[PDB]
Design a protein around this ligand. Structure first.
Ligand code: 78J
Length: 126
C-alpha cells in the first residue's frame, strides 16, 4: 500500500456554493489547462507505485493534481475561487520541489503555470 488515499473531492459537511468565478475556473481555466499537450502527467494523482517513485510521498505531503481539482469544481467542493487557485499553486509547487530544475516535467509545469496565471489575471468580478 504505497500510494496514499487521494485528496478528498467531496465532503458532506463542507459548505458548497455556485458562483460565476468558480464556473469560470471550471469552464475556462481548468478546461484550457486540461486539454493542453503538457496536461497529462497532471491529470490524476501521482501514482508512486506504477511510476516507480517510492520516495514521492515521503517528500510531497500535500499532493494535488488537475484530476482532483476537476472533481472538486464539478462536485461543488469549493466555497470560493482562492481555494481552487491555491490547489493549482500546490500542484505546481510540488512539481518544482520533487523534480530537479531544468527537468522536462518542470518546464511542462512552468508552461501550464504561465497559461494558468494569464487566465487568473482575467478572472471575472463576482
Ligand atoms: C506530477 C509528476 C509526474 C511524474 C511522472 C513521472 N515521473 C516524474 N518524475 C521523474 C523524476 C525523475 N526524472 C524524470 C521525471 O519524470 C520525467 C517526466 C518527463 C515528461 C513526461 C512526464 C515524466 C513525475 N513527476 C511529477 O512531478
Amino acid at each position: 500500500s504505497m500510494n496514499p488515499p487521494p485528496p478528498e473531492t467531496s465532503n458532506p459537511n463542507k459548505p458548497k456554493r455556485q458562483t460565476n468565478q468558480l464556473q469560470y475556473l471550471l469552464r475556462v481555466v481548468l478546461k484550457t489547462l486540461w486539454k493542453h499537450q503538457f496536461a497529462w502527467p497532471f491529470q490524476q494523482p501521482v501514482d508512486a507505485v506504477k511510476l516507480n517513485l517510492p520516495d514521492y510521498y515521503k517528500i510531497i505531503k500535500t499532493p494535488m493534481d488537475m484530476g482532483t481539482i476537476k472533481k472538486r469544481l464539478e462536485n461543488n467542493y469549493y466555497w470560493n475561487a482562492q481555494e481552487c487557485i491555491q490547489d493549482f499553486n500546490t500542484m505546481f509547487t510540488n512539481c518544482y520541489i520533487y523534480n530537479k530544475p531544468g527537468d522536462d516535467i518542470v518546464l511542462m509545469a512552468e508552461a501550464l503555470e504561465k497559461l494558468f496565471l494569464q487566465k487568473i489575471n482575467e478572472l471575472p468580478t463576482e
